[PDB]
């Protein structure tokens, strides 16, 4: 009858301008309003934000726009002993502090087949890319950079021998959606990068470019995909928060 909150990002971290505050519980929350009221977010410089639930165990908070670089964020999850509904109580408080880093926005434009990285507005890298082929296209939209992996076997069985299924080992992989979109090294498609889309949705770039991305792009930085033949990344993907328009985000879903 206890539930433990977990806050992201990590205490003392620096994150990109796309990073939401995330409070994830190890049980379904029956009273979402109770959880929201127990969570106090302090920003400096101060900016308005709001709560939106990705699912029954995880609430996010973000401002209307990407964070301003240098902002300091304090998160007080004051859930100890709080009645979260159906006889579940908060197991502990959590308290985190983080800061927002430089503005890093990478745009993958299917009309040019280039992934351009801008840091505080200036182009710092121009990376030819091969994105999802027409039958398995990369969705347009705004992606929040997540975790990074020096190498990772992307086994879609998280079934491989099924229609648009796969199992591949890749290097220098930066996660940009929970739906399994990565930026990663694809030495096999360098010829195609800048010209032809060949993937299941991942942003294929050169080994050099993928390692640069792994080294320089941090959690909370933004990738924007534009002009593909795909749909739009779902707002509730897990890293798709910004595809939910602010009016809808701000309204929340505490009663859903």
Swiss-Prot record:
Q: Where in the cell is it found?
A: Cell membrane
Record: active site = 184, 202
- One cellular-component annotation, GO: plasma membrane
Residues binding substrate: 166, 179-180, 204
Membrane topology annotation: Lipid-anchor
Q: Which UniProt keywords apply?
A: Acyltransferase, Calcium, Cell membrane, Cell shape, Cell wall biogenesis/degradation, Lipoprotein, Membrane, Metal-binding, Palmitate, Peptidoglycan synthesis, Signal, Transferase
Gene Ontology annotations of biological process type: cell wall organization; peptidoglycan-protein cross-linking; regulation of cell shape
Q: Does the keyword Nucleotidyltransferase apply?
A: no
E.C. designation(s): 2.3.2.-
**Which EC class is the enzyme in?**
transferase
Give residue ranges for domain L,D-TPase catalytic: 104-226
Biological function:
Generates 3->3 cross-links in peptidoglycan, catalyzing the cleavage of the mDap(3)-D-Ala(4) bond of a tetrapeptide donor stem and the formation of a bond between the carbonyl of mDap(3) of the donor stem and the side chain of mDap(3) of the acceptor stem. Is specific for donor substrates containing a stem tetrapeptide since it cannot use pentapeptide stems.
What other remark does the UniProt record contain for this protein?
The peptidoglycan structure of stationary-phase M.tuberculosis is atypical since it contains a majority (80%) of 3->3 cross-links synthesized by L,D-transpeptidases that predominate over the 4->3 cross-links formed by the D,D-transpeptidase activity of classical penicillin-binding proteins. In fact, 3-3 cross-linkages predominate throughout all growth phases and the ratio of 4-3/3-3 linkages does not vary significantly under any growth condition.
Q: What the record says about its domains?
A: Consists of two tandem immunoglobulin-like Big_5 domains in the N-terminal region (residues 56-145 and 150-250), followed by a L,D-transpeptidase catalytic domain (residues 251-378) and a C-terminal tail (residues 379-408).
Q: What is this protein called?
A: L,D-transpeptidase 2
Q: Which organism is it from?
A: Mycobacterium tuberculosis (strain ATCC 25618 / H37Rv)
Q: What is the lineage of its organism?
A: Bacteria, Bacillati, Actinomycetota, Actinomycetes, Mycobacteriales
Q: Which gene encodes it?
A: ldtB
Whole-protein residues included: 150 to 408 of 408
